[PDB]
């Protein structure tokens, strides 16, 4: 309906998340996604897909 | 290389060479054994500096 599975909503967003943020990257100037050797890039890809 | 003393905070400065070593070619390791002369992995052969 929207009162229960609801806001007790975060709890079962802790079968879940405190590992902070990976492509979370959205704030600085030109370089911590254009320098040389990193875990999270094999994803944000194509002009297809 | 070694010589220091133990242990009542770790895994977040574990967020500090897993979150430190910045701005150039190649960056380091996770699990921490002890006490050696330390020949390891593969790096690079020569074009500028």
Curated annotation (Swiss-Prot), chain A:
Localization in the cell: Virion; Host nucleus
Its function? Self-assembles to form an icosahedral capsid with a T=16 symmetry, about 200 nm in diameter, and consisting of 150 hexons and 12 pentons (total of 162 capsomers). Hexons form the edges and faces of the capsid and are each composed of six MCP molecules. In contrast, one penton is found at each of the 12 vertices. Eleven of the pentons are MCP pentamers, while the last vertex is occupied by the portal complex.
Similarity-based family: Belongs to the herpesviridae major capsid protein family.
* Quaternary context: Homomultimer. Makes the hexons and eleven out of twelve pentons. Interacts with triplex proteins 1/TRX1 and 2/TRX2; adjacent capsomers are linked together in groups of three by triplexes, heterotrimeric complexes composed of one molecule of TRX1 and two molecules of TRX2. Interacts with scaffold protein; this interaction allows efficient MCP transport to the host nucleus. Interacts with capsid vertex component 2/CVC2. Interacts with the small capsomere-interacting protein/SCP.
* Name under which the protein is recorded: Major capsid protein
- Naturally occurring in which organism (per UniProt): Varicella-zoster virus (strain Dumas) (HHV-3)
What phylogenetic lineage does the species belong to? Viruses, Duplodnaviria, Heunggongvirae, Peploviricota, Herviviricetes
Identify the coding gene: MCP
């Amino acid at each position: 309906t929207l009162d229960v599975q609801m806001g007790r909503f975060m709890e079962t967003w802790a079968d879940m998340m405190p590992h902070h943020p990976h492509w979370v990257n959205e704030h600085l100037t030109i370089l911590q996604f254009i320098a040389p050797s990193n875990p999270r890039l094999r994803f944000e890809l194509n002009p297809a897909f | 290389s070694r010589g220091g003393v133990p242990m009542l905070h770790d895994n977040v400065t574990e967020s500090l060479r897993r979150i430190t070593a910045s701005g150039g070619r190649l960056n380091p390791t996770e699990p921490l054994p002890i006490f050696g002369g330390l020949r390891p992995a593969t790096s690079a052969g020569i074009a500028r500096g």
